[PDB]
Ligand SMILES: NS(=O)(=O)c1ccc(CNC(=O)N2CCN(c3cc4c(cc3F)c(=O)c(C(=O)O)cn4C3CC3)CC2)cc1
């Protein structure tokens with residue numbers, strides 16, 4: 001009886017195994033655009049993905065992860081609110097059963113169809129397992145997805161999903177350039193928060209881009225054909241793998257832009 005996104009094991013249950021679910025810096029949150037303060041002391045973010053080395057794509061039973069070689073400083077996030085150098089380890093998405101839900105963060109209570117998370121860890125802690133134990137261990141770049149025009153840079157991800165339909169399946173996923181998933185503007189909101197899945201560790205600097213990317217209905221439909229279940233098990237479509245907004249408590253959301 002493990003955690004998930006169903007009636008019996010979803011977000012409202014997680015606190016029983018992971019009491020930090022009710023903690024002081026949980027994610028995601030609603031971004032109230034009128035309350036977020038422009039912080040002129042923030043920097044432009046530095047997204048350096050030219051040497052990124054993607055390796056593999058995995059269906060882990062609650063999302064799919066595109067994994068990178070993080071054994072050297074190849075794809076890094078720096079600047080913005082961050083001190084030091086954060087290495088890209090994986091990206092994944094959260095999405096809905098319908099276009100009107102799926103994102104984890106919300107903007108003035110608006111839900112997007114999906115949300116991309118590019119996960120990076122602070123090189124001063126040496127490895128990801130150590131970094132998640134520190135309050136400044138991870139930086140997650142969040143990007144909203146709306147449904148409209150196709151995103152060309154997503155299609156290589158969409159076309160491999162039939163090969164990882166069920167939990168535990170992986171496929172080779174070399175030579176994928178995550179620059180093709182970015183919007184035009186790097187304007188962002190930032191706040192201190194947590195992993196949005198168990199173990200819900202309070203180790204994340206969140207950087208959420210203001211500009212959504214557009215994907216096509218056909219692209220998100222293929223996300224919704226994935227399975228939470230393993231091969232040969234009763235089919236449970238992988239949909240609604242999002243945690244709802246959590247209390248902001250004693251936090252300030254800062255804006256990079258006027
Ligand atoms: N959204 S966020 O950006 O804030 C964010 C959140 C979270 C992270 C860091 N942790 C993760 O990434 N995890 C959590 C653990 N997870 C699981 C893998 C599982 C199982 C259960 C799991 F929960 C099983 O039960 C299972 C089985 O054999 O039954 C096999 N597998 C592994 C894949 C084969 C894998 C992914 C990073 C970033």
Ligand SMILES: [Zn+2]
Pocket residue numbers: 092093094117196
């Ligand atoms: Zn995530």
